[PDB]
Design a binder for these strands. Structure first.
Lengths: 149, 79, 49, 146, 49, 63, 147, 49, 209
RNA sequence: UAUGCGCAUAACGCCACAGAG
């Protein structure tokens, strides 16, 4: 596996700061298993999300379970199996900051991690025991899929 | 005596070094570098400045009348 | 009004150049500043300092 | 939130009586001649440099401080606050620069009466006689080694 | 008169054929630019270059 | 539009003449002189204001 | 802002409470008897211990730009720039421990970066700074209306 | 309807200090306060935004 | 009157004490920090009654290199000072072999006595100050930088570093208020530490002409 | 100096109006 994070989220609010970019909704979500909360910009033309939607959010370092080869080059012609075949909405972006709170006690149970998917931003905040695989300038894949319950 | 001015070639000195050397290559002065098909004497003078193969002496006059001599080989060129 | 002012200021301050000791001197050797601008620095290059 | 006196008119040693109520350490004035006769010439230099900044700052214009320090160091070179006009150019070394500025016949007449010498180092005097100007690419010479 | 142009670089100017066949430069003849100047002499004063 | 390579000269100063109907020269005036002194290009003023207006050769007694 | 001197320090810190003892005399010429006693002690009671008060009350050294030429002496920067680089060194030292993904930069090579950039930002000899100052007072004056 | 003068330097010295000193690439910052003065204008700052 | 002339005499004593310390004369810390109550304790109050006489406030400071060159500071009694008073002051100076004094007048001198004070030799260097221009020390102002007179060994290495003539160096007048404060002869070079805003401190040099 | 073919022709200022940026 190259999965950096995996959880089931639930949309608690949509655009709270009220900025309303066209084709983009900001989803303030909140987790089920962990203390995680999500802020996520999605494309709502190609993949619309309503209030109260429950979706499964996975963040991976690669799309291939047979060894994290980590190309970063995009062939549309590769019909080899991927992680993305089991998901509905897949992005790809760079982690541009991670931060938390510490006073001589490192990673003191809060660790934000800000990821930008080509301009569609994302923070994933929570306990730092789940936020280990993230570092700045790293490439990650967002992989979300609505759960039908 | 010890030369107490800047070890770097100023921007006004490389203009006049390239001007004088391109005027020399405008006459039939021998070219110290390999011409890779250039026909402009400025480009040849820039290759000679980059290869440290210009022999001209800059005489830096101080405002009392005194001077000190620097070759372009012993000045630090930048971009 | 803005042109004659600039003409007068140019015809006074034209001789002032930075010498090889870093002193801004007039054309007769008269020392106006011992370092240019009291620190010696160039205005286009102090922007990221 | 301090309180400030502001007088329309200038008498610098009159306010020295009231040193117990007024902060005379931070006295300021527009008149550069009053500051030059009360606090010296190196204070009048900073008054010049601050007054030009206050002129341009009404209009949101920021001229860099090094230009103002050079202009004030030139106008206070001789120990007095000198104008930049045809009466402050009488002090100049080069008769040709005085002629190319203003009243060329009067400076020509003075240079002829006094027998004035021009060393041809001014930028005006080098362009009258067709010689390369000393600033820029003319502060130095190039020598060819034999 | 000046007109805009985006499809030249920022360090460039667009010179017309009216001016380009009238403004000359005194290029001295060296053995390493005599083919270019020889083609330029054959073209003459009304054909660019 | 106008362009002047060489041509007629003023009969007093041997500098080019003014006008495009007489096929004359354009000025490189005082503020252009000032702004080119500010570049530090001194041979470019020497070009524009001595080699391309009036470079004459006088005879002096050196004594 | 306060004043310095050898005799000033010797009278200030040392012989103030000593002459605070009573003397019972008059002013000779504009001077207290305590000042006259401190002049007597300074003249006679010191011999090569006034070198201590001489060196402990010496003037601040000149700035580096007037002593060491900034074009040929590395790290000879301005005093304002040295204050700024020291403040940013103290403030940058916190972020390499706090903020994540440290960037293989040190304190001393950062100082060397800033000092070499300060040395390279100097005016080249030849620069007509008077034309630049003239055209920089004159050109904004076209954007200034009248009264 | 503006007009611009194009002076054409006739010596290698003038050319070499027009390439080095007075080039457009070196005039990026204004000497007044060191701020940029070359930059894109009207349509570009709308479509880039 | 009283309580105003005592304030004026206190301020123009404190200022000439700061002046004499800045010129390099031996002045104690208590004599610099003299409060107005300590001034009423040392010298009298009621100058109209005459417990402080201006004859009684004449000080004699001495210089820190050697006690051979000491300096008077005279506060003359008459408001308008003529040659008749400065002849008496020079007769006081010739007894104790004093080569320098400083007269603090309360209205200005006559121009004949001004030319008299200039007309004394190098044997008698007499200077004059108005009382009004001693109510505040001008060197404590925020715009006035620090002025340091240079020894002839420092002027030599100055003119040797820049390969410079004294004709080329900037000028400060000898009637300049800070040149009159520091008591600088013509021909001496004054080092000036400017509190710069672009740099921290800036050393410039001016010659007294 | 320009044009034309060494040759032939033409070799400008001052005011005042109007205009361009």
């Amino acid at each position: 596996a190259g999965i950096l994070f995996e959880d089931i989220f639930d949309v608690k609010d949509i655009d709270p700061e009220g900025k309303k970019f066209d084709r983009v909704s900001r989803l303030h979500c909140e987790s089920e298993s962990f203390k995680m909360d999500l802020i996520l910009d999605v494309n709502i033309q190609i993949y619309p999300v309503d209030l109260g939607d429950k979706f499964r959010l996975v963040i991976a370092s690669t799309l291939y379970e047979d060894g994290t080869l980590d190309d970063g080059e995009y062939n549309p012609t590769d019909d080899r199996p991927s992680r993305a075949d089991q998901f509905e909405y897949v992005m790809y972006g760079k982690v541009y900051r991670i931060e938390g709170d510490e006073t001589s006690t490192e990673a003191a149970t809060r660790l934000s991690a800000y990821v930008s998917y080509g301009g569609l931003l994302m923070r994933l905040q929570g306990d730092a025991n789940n936020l280990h695989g993230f570092e700045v300038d790293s490439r990650v894949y967002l992989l979300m899929k609505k759960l039908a319950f | 005596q010890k030369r107490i001015t800047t070890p770097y070639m100023t921007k006004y000195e490389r203009a006049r070094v390239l001007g004088t050397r391109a005027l020399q290559i405008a006459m039939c002065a021998p070219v110290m570098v390999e011409l890779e098909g250039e026909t402009d004497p400025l480009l040849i003078a820039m290759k000679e400045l980059k290869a440290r193969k210009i022999p001209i002496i800059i005489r830096r006059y101080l405002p009392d009348g005194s001077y000190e001599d620097w070759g372009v080989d012993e000045l630090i060129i930048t971009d | 009004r803005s042109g004659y002012l600039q003409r007068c200021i140019i015809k006074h301050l034209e001789g002032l150049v930075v010498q090889y000791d870093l002193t801004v001197r007039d054309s007769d050797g008269s020392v106006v500043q011992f370092l240019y601008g009291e620190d010696g620095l160039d205005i286009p290059k102090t922007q990221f300092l | 939130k301090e309180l400030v006196l502001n007088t329309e008119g200038i008498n610098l040693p009159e306010l020295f009586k009231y040193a117990e109520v007024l902060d005379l350490r931070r006295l300021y004035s527009n008149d550069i001649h009053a500051i030059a006769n009360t606090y010296g010439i190196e204070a009048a230099l900073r008054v010049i440099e601050k007054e030009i900044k206050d002129v341009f700052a009404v209009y949101g214009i920021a001229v860099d401080p090094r230009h103002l320090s050079l202009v004030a160091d030139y106008m206070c070179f001789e120990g007095v606050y000198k104008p930049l006009n045809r009466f402050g150019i009488r002090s100049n070394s080069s008769p040709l620069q005085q002629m190319t500025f203003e009243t060329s016949f009067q400076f020509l007449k003075q240079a002829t009466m006094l027998g004035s010498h021009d060393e041809l180092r001014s930028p005006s005097a080098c362009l009258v006689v067709g010689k390369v100007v000393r600033g820029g690419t003319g502060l130095f010479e190039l020598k060819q080694p034999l | 008169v000046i007109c805009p142009d985006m499809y030249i670089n920022t360090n460039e100017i667009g010179i017309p054929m009216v001016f380009a066949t009238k403004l000359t430069y005194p290029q001295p003849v060296t053995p390493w630019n005599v083919q270019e100047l020889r083609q330029a002499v054959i073209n003459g004063p009304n054909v660019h270059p | 539009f106008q362009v002047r390579t060489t041509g007629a000269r003023d009969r007093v100063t041997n500098q080019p003449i003014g006008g495009r109907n007489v096929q004359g020269g354009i000025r490189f005036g005082e503020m252009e002189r000032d702004a080119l002194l500010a570049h530090g290009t001194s041979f470019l003023l020497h070009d524009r204001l001595f080699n391309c207006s009036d470079r004459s050769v006088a005879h002096v007694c050196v004594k | 802002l306060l004043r310095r001197g050898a005799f000033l320090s010797y009278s200030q810190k040392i012989q103030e409470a000593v002459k605070a003892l009573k003397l019972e005399s008059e002013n000779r010429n504009g001077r207290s008897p305590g000042t006259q006693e401190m002049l007597r002690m300074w003249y006679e009671l010191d011999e090569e211990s006034r070198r201590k008060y001489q060196k402990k009350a010496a003037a601040c050294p000149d700035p580096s730009l007037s002593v060491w030429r900034p074009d040929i002496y590395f790290a000879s920067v301005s005093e304002t720039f040295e204050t700024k680089v020291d403040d940013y060194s103290q403030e940058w030292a916190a972020q390499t421990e706090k903020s994540y993904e440290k960037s293989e930069l040190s304190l001393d090579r950062l100082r060397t970066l800033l000092q070499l950039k300060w040395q390279r930002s100097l005016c080249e000899p030849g620069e007509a700074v008077g034309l630049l100052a003239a055209q920089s007072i004159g050109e904004p004056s076209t954007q200034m209306t009248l009264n | 309807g503006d007009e611009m003068n194009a002076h054409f330097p006739q010596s290698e010295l003038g050319r070499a200090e027009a390439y080095v000193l007075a080039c457009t690439d070196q005039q990026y910052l204004v000497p007044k306060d060191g701020q940029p003065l070359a930059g894109l204008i009207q349509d570009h700052m709308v479509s880039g935004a | 009157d009283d309580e105003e002339e005592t304030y004026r005499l206190w301020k123009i004593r404190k200022t000439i004490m700061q002046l004499c310390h800045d010129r390099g004369y031996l002045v104690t810390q208590d004599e610099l920090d003299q409060t107005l109550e300590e001034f009423k304790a040392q010298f009298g109050d009621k100058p109209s009654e005459g417990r402080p006489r201006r004859t009684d406030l004449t000080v004699l400071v001495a210089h820190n290199d050697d006690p051979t060159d000491q300096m008077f500071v005279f506060f003359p009694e008459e408001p308008k000072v003529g040659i008749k008073t400065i002849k008496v002051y020079c007769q006081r100076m010739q007894e104790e072999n004093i080569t320098r004094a400083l007269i603090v007048v309360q209205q200005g001198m006559t121009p004949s006595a001004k030319q008299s004070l200039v007309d004394m030799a190098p044997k008698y260097i007499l200077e004059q100050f108005l009382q009004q221009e001693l109510l505040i020390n001008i060197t404590e102002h925020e715009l006035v930088p620090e002025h340091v007179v240079m020894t002839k060994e420092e002027v030599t290495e100055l003119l040797a570093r820049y390969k410079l003539r004294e004709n080329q160096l900037p000028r400060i007048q000898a009637g300049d208020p800070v040149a009159r404060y520091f008591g600088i002869k013509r021909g001496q070079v004054v080092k000036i530490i400017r509190p710069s805003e672009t740099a921290g401190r800036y050393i410039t040099y001016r010659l007294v002409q």
